[model samples]
Target: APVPPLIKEATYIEATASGYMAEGVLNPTIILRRGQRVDMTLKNKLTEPTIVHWHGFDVNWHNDAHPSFAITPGESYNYSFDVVNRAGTYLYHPHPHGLTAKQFYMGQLGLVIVEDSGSDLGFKYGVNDLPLVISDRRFIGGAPVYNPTPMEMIAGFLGNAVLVNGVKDAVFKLSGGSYRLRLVNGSNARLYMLSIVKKNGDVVPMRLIAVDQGFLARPIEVRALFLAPAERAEVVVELGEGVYLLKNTPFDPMHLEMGHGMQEALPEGSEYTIATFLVEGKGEAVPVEALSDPPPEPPKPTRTRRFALSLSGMQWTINGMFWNASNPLFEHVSVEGVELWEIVNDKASMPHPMHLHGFPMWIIERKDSPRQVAELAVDNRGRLPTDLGLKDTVLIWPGETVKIVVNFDAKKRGQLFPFHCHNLEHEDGGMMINIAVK
Candidate 1:
């Protein structure tokens, strides 16, 4: 296979699906090598303006893709920058404040993969490797429904069909050996408990390589992987090279309202497979161990910064502040120094896949530490994956919070980048805010 072309020269570009890429919207799964320059362009083709945020990348500030500065129709901006970041899975989508939901639902999402240059895990790309774009689309009759009412917001919109890799009712046949699956939870507001359900209705265990960060020191196995919106998980599964049903363990959205176990599947669009992996055989497949043998992660975050992931009524805010382009989101009002960011979610109802641009954050601590500041001083059991060295998006589980410490040296300097729940509808309904950098 030829090397993928680099987006040189900070080119001008636009995103829209007028023809086939629009039928379900285009999902261009392109490969990006580690340690390369990614100069690109974004042109707004729709009637309403939109912004394209490089979901996960350690780019500069101005190019962080702020929704406040919408790329109006026919107007395009060049997002030229270096891709000097970790090699893993990332995504792209619309971030315009009020219109994020409709545009994304209408299909404006794409997949961007960063490959391990010399550290070839010796896995397949398009053939054996899979990019699972799990999303929920509201379908009226046979098409997707974009409009949401008050009740819809409370319950969260449920689509009749789940699309994987842009295919409705999609499934894949895996040839034994080992397959590296890049899971991107692209849903608006649905949390999927993805497990390999055997024909006998049993759950098969799988190994996870990369979490929100790229790779771990070693791989960890789990029964099911919880994928929130915009979260990325790179897992390597060595199947018996047979037919397997890739099932999505459903969650009851109403559970948050009624307060009960989150295991209720409504009869409407209940349980189903987003994709099927038919493993051929373990023929000449590289050992899953090879993929696990990446470089050692850098030292843990040096300094700690505590951030409150909360919502003021309906508007989302970090550290009790909604997004304002004037106030720098990660700025220190008291001191002048770079610090690690420990994000804690005050709400216990839903999991929000929070994202920060122009920098890859290290997921060091989860909600395990009742005492935030002290727990971070020591490396605990779930001290991020070895591959979790750097990440752009991390999913903070319900009742669980995540603390990531990062420096502000790489991010853009002028305006603030918006971070909120990847659920576009919620973002449009004022579940988003931003901060500027000096």
Candidate 2:
């Protein structure tokens, strides 16, 4: 038997001019080969207890970072698991229930790049392979603010400032060529409508090659894409000597606000420049299609479970049930069972981006109120092109019902895992549930 690989011990993070960073590295990126086994030893230096949740992996529950096993201050947690998930952009973040938003807002997250067993996109893109960890921040006195006022809690805190890979108003220089940009929306609540546009605001073409779960059947070309919290996407952009902007159009989640006691609403119709892309000297044109893997078999659902998203005042509920950590099993399932989960936003307005742990799912259908259907028809119309890929988080709009089929495995039995809204405030308020695999 061989000893497992050991990850660097993390203590605390500090805020710098660049943004908050892990104690040692300015920005740490962990690389793991697919199908490898390793051990991660995480030590807490902060005052409170915390656990590291590997956002998109399918490891067993004991090592899954469930809040039930938080490591207290000065205590260490040993996380040993195999890299069983497909190669893609996943992330790690603190998972303490009430403190998740604060921790992440203060820069307590990092990227995990799992290499594909067969295809190598990094080789295809060479030096042009870029990993963009997108997040938002609000600072007071040059330090990131973690505590949100009551008003800010009504809707998750929306940052007036943006950062990419910990750099404020970040800029990336690209040699004129096709580059693979891996984008992760690491925000607590903000949903980004991302697009590449010329400095003059003309839309540029981009090929979408992967989603949160992994490779798409084939590349889908699009002018824009919507990414909710905890979602990741990989795109290939072909450019010549020019400057472009990674822009985010105004998205008011307020349309989905059903909770009362809110003082003010976020302004509607706002656009912000997220990052600048500067292109220089040209390189050989590359075919991005060659970077894809074979399409996976579609799943067949065996059962359907219904869930409703509701909120009142500051209380958020999933299926009318508040999360109870003392006894947190929301549902139970047998090993290898495939089920279709129908998530509904029963509130008149408010969208919930529901995220499930330990498995990827396929979107089967979306049913919305007649009014919402008409609005969607005019606004983007039908299922998004990105929805074709496997996903761990799917956005359920107000008055909408989203259906997805997921397959569970015995490997996850005996312990519990969580499924919750990606909006940290909502999740903290009670919009989370746990599943027990038997």
Candidate 3:
């Protein structure tokens, strides 16, 4: 494979979710031209064990989803892989079994925009082509404050203010031509339903090209899109002259709270705005851009299994179990080439962002419909709004069931991989589990 020009072999990189993001002026960015070999080394300074999971890279078996082999605290590991797979916007994050959520929610995440030879680089690529990583944090003097009571655990952390690109009340200046906006819900527990409302009350339409796993076969647009923790969306929007606020309409998963058996509601009105875009200059609105190469007709329907995403005691859970990597579940399945998992979020109150470490799967169905929502809530279950893109990590909203079709041909012959909540706090609090790959 052709390796692209060397950027940096290794650099002092730090992972920050809450504190780091708020303090760090510039978040790290990685760029890869198609068919380029990319390499970097990560050293863990935090007290917890952390592994970097390539969100959309197809690599060797050992480099696949094996979180057991990680860059331990004060230890270092090399993340060298080729960007030979279908590319659009991919990401990377820490996936250590127990501390995944804490690091992620703390802002230990970065974005990679894989450039295709067929792409038009006319739009902003680096600083201008913004990678908006959205998260909600309770900030006092711009520092993260986490005080999760037992009730907060079951209900999930609901922050008062939304942080975009790790900035509170953020805005951008666009000379406006055509801009590609890549949105990643880097939140620990919050989900987003996004819409662009101009100060003049005009709604700027968003062209959604891709989702978490990769892109949609073709780009499509809707009134709104939903974003869940660890989920990514590639949106192309034409900016008109003037300023606009990228807003996430409030979605009440209030109904789900009661059935969760939580015994109490989250602080009322804990929901609010996530991001704002100030389009001061004029530009033409372009038609939607594509998400990815057309998908191959959802790999013929195979077997399906239903697992319940539930909450009991003070913490949230999957299949009524917390994380245990030693003797993992999900290992009993045969080495069949195809497997379908139906995740039912029986809890009416709280939602969980379910993430699998190794194999990036295609989401065939969410809430029994073909849908996608980025940055906000648009369904009864308060789920993701668009199906125009591919995804590895997905959110199971309150009272909703999400069915995902996945295949594990990565040759997991010797060890275990992880699957857990993208919400770092919840993961630290123990909403995680692993599978022995054979």
Candidate 4:
């Protein structure tokens, strides 16, 4: 039987306020049905070499957009694979060696949504179900900046402006109903402490339904949630007849990285408004039970290994070694074998969001102790309900150790997949290592 597929092209997307989005956009959306085979072709129109990485999908290695196999200018790549990933809010972005940060910061990214036959969450929410591709950018003379300065690269290019779905100061009109906002932190290196505050100065509670992988054991209600770069969270917001501001509270990376002796600090009490939700009409709230699912248990690990995330001078490193695309495999595992990986960050108090490719992982444990906050002693909060689900990216704070059990799928054999820091600058600065599955 012949398979029908969705075709997309990578081209420039122009923004009136930011001049030109040089890296371009993936028009509309690329949606895949659960259990269906996908025949997707990516046509790169940009002058630079680029490849589309299906972030969070358990696709085969050849079609996984490994940095070593980038398509040059005027070339296209065909990615054919089974839709093995569960229905969720996934993403796609360019993964060119040493240029991911530059291209992604220039706006070369898009959303990938997988539909499930068993859920009616999308049908009930209708258009109210939104994909908020949250990102930040720095503009110079009315143009967005791509390259970073020496010091800026040391930390990261923290943009002054926040954008949602390619627009600045984005506004979403809503009725007095429940809306599922899928939030993806696509920033280069900024952590967001997101909160919803009503116009009357009251904080609204958010019900978090899913994390990076998919639906959690159950929806967890919280006042605020912290989002590291490249992490995704699905939350249901119940709005009344009024206005609300989605704002970012103070989350200083310098404080988390205090062990490095870097004294950078954000302005005192700095809180930026990210987006506004204007509510008018009244509607019924979506049933939370409809999207809830039982938590999954990972298989028993057959092997265990530990990797350390550190910094050597100006370069970020993994296991004390920098990134080398042609280097030997960091570790090896047999197909379908389960392994428990202990990811450690002890070189500095730097927070590193460790992200694994090819499969989602179950986080077993994390650091629970005192932490530094704005140069002050603060008790560290352990994992939250949102952290209980399967995740492709887990944020590891300074001096924190995280243990995750991962099962290598049998479908991708004799392939290499890279696991590295989700911070673009850190990964580009040599914090990446590849794993071999045989």
The prediction achieving the highest lDDT against the true structure is 2
Q: Estimate, for each residue in 1-438, the C-alpha lDDT of model 4 and write its tens digit.
A: 001122233232222122123234233456667787776666666677778788998887777878777887767778877787777878788777787888788766666777777544743432567777778888778677776777566566677688887778888777888778888898888777788889758988888888888888777787777788888888888888989988887655544342433333333126878888888888667766666445588789988988887767777777777677664354432344788998888645477788888989998776632253222211233555556778999887776778889988665667888888888888777777777776
User: What is the per-residue lDDT of model 1 for residues 350-381, given as tens digits with 9 covering 90 to 100?
Assistant: 44667666555656666542332223222553
The most accurate candidate by TM-score is 2
Q: For model 3, how many clashes?
A: 41
| lDDT of the candidates, in the order given | 0.60, 0.72, 0.62, 0.71
Tell me each candidate's RMSD, in Å, in order. Answer: 5.2, 5.0, 5.3, 5.4
Worst 10 residues of 3 by lDDT: 1-10
lDDT of 2 by residue, 1-438 (tens): 011122344334432223235545654666777788867677776777778888888887767778778877878778887887787878777888787787777767777778776555644422667777778876677666767776566577777677887777888777787778778888888778788888985888878888887888878788777788888889888878889888887554445564432432323236888899888787756666664564477578777888878876567777677687665544533334788888788755466789988888887777763342333331243566567778888888787788888887666667687888998977877777777777
- Residue 248 alpha-carbon offset, candidate 3, angstroms: 1.4
Error of 4 at 87 (Å): 1.2
In candidate 4, position 287 carries an lDDT of 62
What TM-score do all the candidates reach, one by one? 0.81, 0.88, 0.82, 0.87
> lDDT value for candidate 3?
0.62
**Residue 219 local lDDT, model 2:** 83
Give, for candidate 1, the lowest lDDT window spanning 10 residues: 1-10
RMSD of 4: 5.4
TM-score of model 2 vs. true structure: 0.88
By descending TM-score, how would the candidates be arranged?
2, 4, 3, 1
Rank candidates, lDDT, best first. 2, 4, 3, 1
